[PDB]
Every structure is written in C-alpha cells, then in structure tokens.
C-alpha cells in the first residue's frame, strides 16, 4: 500500500488543493513544469505516494480537479504550479452550483459525477496498490459540499475497502459567503459521518482568529487562511511522503485514531504559526501544538477529552527531548486524555523540515470538544430552519423538508455520541 489518489472539489477545494500541491512539490524538489531539480534521494523515495512518473522522467500529481463552473479551475491553470496537473484530470461543468447543496448533490453535480469517476478510475487502474483517497473541499458552498459528498458516496460504492480521508473547511459567519452555509454544512456532515474514515475539520473561524490575533494581519484574505491550511496539510502527510523506519500508511492511522467509527472528526494544529529568525526549542513546539490558539478547529480542548492524539515533529532535533516533552504534557494534564485508552498519544519524528522553518510540529487530535463545532452549526441551522427560511432554493431542486430534519437529527446524535465519552 503506497498510492493515494487526491480529489479537490469546488472553489475552496481547488484553492487549498493547489496550495497543498505547491507546498509539497517544493519539499520534493519538483518544479512548476514537473521535473525534479532537488538533491536528496529522500525526496524521491516515497514520491510514488502522490505522483506518477511520466515520459522523460516528469512527475505528475495523482490529482483530479473538480468544479461545476470553469472559474476556479481556469485560475489554477494560469496559476504558478498549473502546468504540472494532468490536463485530462480537469473535469468541469459550466452552469455552477449557486452555493446550493442540492445542485451539487442531486441535479447539476449528478450530471458531471460519472465523468469525474472515469478519471478517478483512470488514476486508480495505474496504482500498484491503491491505499486510499483524500478530498479537499468546503461544506459551506454547493460544489465542494454537495458534489464532494456525492463523489465520496460513489467512490465508496466502487472502492468499498479503501480509505477515505477529507480535508473539510467547515464554515463560519466571520468568514461567510452566504447565509445558507449552515444548511449546506449540516447536510454534508451527515454524509461524512457515514462515508469517511478520517475527516480533518478545518474551521474558517479558527483560521481567521489565527490570522487576525496571533499573526497581526488586520484584514486577512482567503490566501492568508490557505497558507495555514497548506502548511497543516503538509504536516499531517509528512510521514507518508518521507522515510522511514517507523514508516506509515493511512489504514494504520485510521485504525489507531478512531475508537468508534462515527467519531473520526479530527482537530488539526500547527507550530510555529507563520506568514522566522529564532528557531523554537522542543518544549515550545510541544507547548504551542497543544495550545488552543494553534488549533484549526475552533474548539477549546479543555471543554472535552482526547480519545487519541497523533503528533508529527519535523526537523533535526533530540528524539530524547521530544519523548520527554510529550510525556510531560500527558503526565501534567492527564485529566484531558481518556484513561480507558492506554498510550493514546503517538509521536513521530521526521528529519526533513518544511520551507522556511528549521523545526515544526503538526498536531492531530480526536477530542470530544469537537462537538462544539457541530453544536455551533446546529444552532445556526435551526435559527433559519425553524422558520423554513431560504428552503425554497433547495425545494426547487427536488429536496424535501424531511431530509433537513433527518440531517439535523443525525448531527445532534453525533454531538450526543461525542458527549457520551467526555463523561465516561
């Protein structure tokens, strides 16, 4: 099991996805046209996880670009690393999704979904041993939310035994396109609970506050929000992309991180937070990555308990001092880690650091506090839904009010389920 197939859905999906590929191509020494111009053999030793090798020794990403309008995917092609993606893997409709789940899932997206899966199959067929799939998308809009969750269901039908990861940008009024986002998010969450093994909850509320408060950016763009995401995305995928001895796959992570199948909603963190000259000591990275300020999902981890943690330190450092520091926060704050899962924090180290920093730390937490994020969207949903506000946009595409009442209830059970183990 080596190969991962990547899909990126809609505006946000394709935007953060582009940056993920820009970031990791740089770490692997792969230039904008697809040729390798690095130095180490360690850059190429697990390049087959995210790249196909082409004629004339070009490296092309195993990446499929999906949208219901040509806007964003045109910008990706014009953008800095656009010439590397296989042009056949640009699959786009024309009419758009209008920030409407129904359009993405049931009508406009239904028309395009088969043509997307053909390319998925095309990239899968030439995988020595396909391990799984990862999707970048948002739950607030139409395409990424609706069509993204449809593709997830189609991919599961056709490849029911592979791993399905998502990097899912959860919405927020602080960084809002449209009032209907909580509807879209809530319909998507119900899908993700069934059809994904891991879902990385990127919350736009959190990314804003990190950009605003802890980076001193007064007026942050989506660009500033996506820097944080593409750094985090490089961080969690480090151990797949590099050697070694203590090397990794998706399924073992999914197994060890997810004690109950519906509870697979992780809370990312990164340290230090960038947009520097003093390198951080190991005790600082450990303090920072566990800080609520560094979390990408706007939840206070003190309001719940960790079921499992996974931590990935990058850089040349004392593995003695990492162990010692990781054992310090566990032994000094043991009330916030469940007692009934022994040794539930796993640490890995990787010698290659990311562009800019001499040593970093990425944090993956399956905390019960993540219920707060779903409670927030569940409140935003009901304020509107209790007056059937804005439903005409969805019922016009064939949707029923029953489907909304279901998706509401499924997510309120998810919050109950997370609350259950926060007390036990």
């Amino acid at each position: 099991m080596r190969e991962i197939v990547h899909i990126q859905a809609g505006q946000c999906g394709n935007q953060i996805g582009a940056k993920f590929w820009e970031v990791i191509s740089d770490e692997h020494g792969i230039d904008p046209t697809g040729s390798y111009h690095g130095d180490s053999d360690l850059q190429l030793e697990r390049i087959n996880v995210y790249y196909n090798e082409a004629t004339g020794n070009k490296y092309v990403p195993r990446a499929i670009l999906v949208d219901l309008e040509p806007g964003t995917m045109d910008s990706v092609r014009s953008g800095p690393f656009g010439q590397i993606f296989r042009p056949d893997n640009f699959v786009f409709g024309q009419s758009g999704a209008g920030n409407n789940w129904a359009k993405g899932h049931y009508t406009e997206g239904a028309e395009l979904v088969d043509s997307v899966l053909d390319v998925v199959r095309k990239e899968s067929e030439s995988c020595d041993c396909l391990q799984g799939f990862q999707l970048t998308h948002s739950l607030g809009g139409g395409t990424g939310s609706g069509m993204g969750t449809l593709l997830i269901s189609k991919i599961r039908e056709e490849y029911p035994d592979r791993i399905m990861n998502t990097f899912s940008v959860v919405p927020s009024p602080k960084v809002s396109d449209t009032v209907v986002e909580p509807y879209n998010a809530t319909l998507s969450v119900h899908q993700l609970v069934e059809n994904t093994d891991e879902t990385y909850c990127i919350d736009n509320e959190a990314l804003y506050d990190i950009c605003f408060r802890t980076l001193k950016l007064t007026t942050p763009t989506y660009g500033d929000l996506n820097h944080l995401v593409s750094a985090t995305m490089s961080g969690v995928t480090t151990c797949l992309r590099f050697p070694g001895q203590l090397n990794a796959d998706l399924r073992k992570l999914a197994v060890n991180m997810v004690p109950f199948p519906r509870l697979h909603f992780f809370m990312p963190g990164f340290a230090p937070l960038t947009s520097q000259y003093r390198a951080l000591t190991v005790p600082e990275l450990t303090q920072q990555m566990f800080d609520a300020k560094n979390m990408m999902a706007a939840c206070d981890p003190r309001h719940g308990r960790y079921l499992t943690v996974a931590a990935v330190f990058r850089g040349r450092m004392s593995m003695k001092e990492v162990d010692e520091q990781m054992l310090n926060v566990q032994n000094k704050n043991s009330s916030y880690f469940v007692e009934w899962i022994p040794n539930n924090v796993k640490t890995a180290v990787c010698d290659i650091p990311p562009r800019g920093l001499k040593m970093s730390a990425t944090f993956i937490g399956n905390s019960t506090a993540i219920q707060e994020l779903f409670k927030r969207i569940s409140e935003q949903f009901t304020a509107m839904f209790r007056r059937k506000a804005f439903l005409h946009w969805y019922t016009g595409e064939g949707m029923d009010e029953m489907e909304f009442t279901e998706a509401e209830s499924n997510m309120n059970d998810l919050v109950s389920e997370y609350q259950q183990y926060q007390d036990a």
Binding site: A102, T107, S153, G398
Partner: protein
C-alpha cells in the same frame, strides 16, 4: 441512496414542468375568458344600436301611416 438521488431529480423536473403546465393553462383560461367578455360587451353595444334603427323605422312609418 441511488434510488433517492433519482427520486429528487425526477421531482425537480416534475414541479418545473407542473409550473409551466399550470402557467400555460391559466394564461389560456384568461385569454379565452377575456375574448368572450370583450365580444359580449361589443355585441350588447351593437344590439342596442340595432334596436335604435328598428325604433327609427316605427317613427318613419307613423308619419306615413298618419295621413
């Protein structure tokens, strides 16, 4: 879920079509009811003017038939 996906898009077509149908018919009802009403008005106007002619024939005979 696959049969539900088709049930939604079939319903989306059904009501889009139904809106065209009941618009198309409601408009036909009005344009026919109107044309009936407008001609009913102009027929009664002309029938009162045709009744004036028959009275003017009684007046033109009462001159002839009173000599």
């Amino acid at each position: 879920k696959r049969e539900h996906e088709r049930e939604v898009i079939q319903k989306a077509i059904e009501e889009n079509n139904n809106f065209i149908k009941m618009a198309k018919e409601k408009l036909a009802q009005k344009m026919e009811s109107n044309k009936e009403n407008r001609e009913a008005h102009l027929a009664a106007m002309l029938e009162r003017l045709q009744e004036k002619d028959k009275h003017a024939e009684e007046v033109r005979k009462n001159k002839e038939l009173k000599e």
